[PDB]
Paper text:
O-acetyl serine sulfhydrylase (OASS), referred to as cysteine synthase (CS), synthesizes cysteine from O-acetyl serine (OAS) and sulfur in bacteria and plants. The inherent challenge for CS is to overcome 4 to 6 log-folds stronger affinity for its natural inhibitor, serine acetyltransferase (SAT), as compared with its affinity for substrate, OAS. Our recent study showed that CS employs a novel competitive-allosteric mechanism to selectively recruit its substrate in the presence of natural inhibitor. Results show that CS uses a noncatalytic residue, M120, located 20 Å away from the reaction center, to discriminate in favor of substrate.
In the wild-type CS, side chain of M120 interacts with the main-chain amino group of S70 and main-chain carboxyl group of A69 of “TSGNT” loop at 3.8 Å and 3.7 Å, respectively. Mutation of M120 disrupts the interaction between S70 and A68 of the peptide loop and pushing the loop ∼3.8 Å further away to postbinding conformation. This reduces the chances of incoming inhibitor to latch onto the binding loop as compared with reference conformation present in the wild-type, thus reducing the affinity of inhibitor. On-rate binding constants of mutants of HiM120A, HiM92A, and HiM120 AM92A are ∼286-fold, 80-fold, and 200-fold lower than that of HiCS wild-type. In HiCS, M120 favors substrate binding by a factor of ∼858-fold as M120A mutation reduces the rate of substrate binding by 286-fold and peptide binding by threefold. M120A mutation reduced the affinity for inhibitor peptides by 3, 5, and 1.4-fold in HiCS, StCS, and MtCS, although the reduction in MtCS was statistically insignificant. In the absence of substrate, M120 interaction with inhibitor/substrate binding “TSGNT” loop stabilizes the CS·Inhibitor complex, but M120 disengages the “TSGNT” loop as soon as it senses the substrate at the active site entrance.
Residue numbers in the entry:
A (entry chain X), B (entry chain X): 2 to 314
Write the structure that this text describes.
């Protein structure tokens, strides 16, 4: 059909079988880089705006404010442009020129907060701007907004079900906001009624889901797997549908994304490498020999050209 | 379904209606950035390899050689990786570090030719490598290989026909190799039998198609619209199916791509801006008031972050 604006074109991303991972083709990847602003977040940028519209919280003239410069910021930016909203994104003055340019290109009002304050300083500023005129500004809050996992339950999940003809046995997804694994798992286990294994992936450097579930002291840590490992349990992560948590280290995630490019011809991002590394480990366990493992690849390689993904390559 | 490798996932790109161009929504764009290596060329990288396989010109152990660092080089790179071929790309030593990294990431053997020799020096070197052992090397030749327009006749064209329910009246496409407009036009005019208007787009700086058709001295010139305006009439441009040629200047192409980003939320590349600028001009002629104009957008914005598209933004 013909989409009325770019937000409506979200999803319908392809599944590609891996040849150099898994065992006898039991690992299949879902390419979320193929989306209107080239990541999985395009789905939630679209649906958080749509739902806010339906709820009356977003109206003509009101402006979006958020504190992200990552995939969600880019997603909200294209949606704001497509649907005629002003958007302000806050972020530390220390952000890359290339990302500022991308966001400025999409028409975003950039508010650069103090470098020394990092992400926290940006979050504060966004909240202070919203507090300045709550009748004018709306913060959509990707970590707790249920419209996030809801779009995955309505789109990403049913796409996996349909493209595998219901044969999917395992879903492997890195957890950032938790929306993907939550929505996908709700779709497949509840709407389609299949008792699959839902695998959350997190960095070994910041294994807060593993620590939580084990009743251990929660100890986040720095890592390089962009998009996952936020260092807390997000509200949009439904722990009740998680069957297994796999941890992956930053180096192996990076190495795996590079293997995806050079061995599979798949331009995967960093967290995509992490997710495939976790899935490859499961795929080589005899218990998963006859099981179809579907892996979310959240983003595309070119978004990481100034990162360690290509540094030294 | 589940694609056996990434090359099979080509195409099925969405159509999005423009709100700030055209008149009463008569301009619709086809997003070719949504492809396995993120450009229209993914289709021809796939099909030139497939056809060479079918023809017996490409076999296990033979290696691809070409002289491109652009979208076609990236396309051939992902296909070579996906299907297990070694690939050598030649290009001037003066190429960006970011593009070298991308290609190295995809597993390409880079051969850097002398800076002073430009594209010609790279073409020579590729030809010299092929000449060195013609039993080992294959050059697929995007400007003359009929597998290029053929994939557009089999995929891009029928996608436009189906997504518009046969209502497409005009196709607007920048000409690089000519494959897109040629294949699309053959599909719609010959296979589906509709007498549409096929519009080739070229830079006003290098208007060789316009000059040729007018019987004027052919005078190429430099421009910034990457991907089009090769400065000659390619063999894969079928002049017999071109109804109209529109010229667009580099500044307006750039400005238009920026308008696509900020006003439509569409992350278009430079040549996408050129194609929409040409289509917008036609769309505002009363003769095209009631006509559905479909525009090819060959690539995505992030591939141009170090270009004039974002410089000064």
């Amino acid at each position: 059909a013909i989409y009325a604006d770019n937000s409506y074109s979200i999803g319908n991303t392809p599944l590609v079988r891996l040849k150099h991972f898994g065992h006898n083709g039991n690992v299949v990847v879902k390419i979320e880089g193929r989306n209107p602003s080239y990541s999985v977040k395009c789905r939630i940028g679209a649906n958080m705006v749509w739902q806010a519209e339906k709820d009356g919280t977003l109206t003509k003239g009101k402006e979006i404010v958020d504190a992200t410069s990552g995939n969600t910021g880019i997603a909200l930016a294209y949606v704001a442009a497509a649907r005629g909203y002003k958007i302000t994104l806050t972020m530390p003055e220390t952000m890359s020129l290339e990302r500022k340019r991308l966001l400025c290109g999409l028409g975003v009002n950039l508010v650069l907060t103090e470098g020394a304050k990092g992400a926290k300083g940006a979050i504060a500023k966004a909240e202070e701007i919203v507090a300045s005129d709550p009748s004018r500004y709306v913060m959509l809050k990707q970590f707790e907004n249920p419209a996030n996992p809801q779009i995955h339950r309505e789109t990403t999940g049913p796409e996996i079900w349909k493209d595998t003809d219901g044969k999917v046995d395992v879903v492997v997804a890195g957890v950032g906001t938790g929306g993907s694994i939550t929505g996908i798992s709700r779709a497949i286990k509840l709407d389609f009624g299949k008792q699959i294994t839902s695998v959350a992936v997190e960095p070994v450097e910041s294994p807060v889901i593993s620590q939580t579930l084990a009743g251990e002291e929660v100890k986040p840590g720095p890592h390089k797997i962009q998009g996952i490992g936020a260092g807390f349990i997000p509200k949009n992560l439904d722990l009740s549908i998680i069957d297994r948590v796999e941890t992956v280290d930053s180096d192996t995630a990076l190495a795996t994304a590079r293997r995806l490019m050079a061995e599979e011809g798949i331009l995967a991002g960093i967290s995509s490498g992490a997710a495939v590394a976790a899935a490859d480990r499961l795929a080589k366990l005899p218990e998963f020999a006859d099981k179809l493992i579907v892996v979310i690849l959240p983003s595309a390689s070119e978004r990481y050209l100034s990162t360690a993904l290509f540094e030294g390559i």
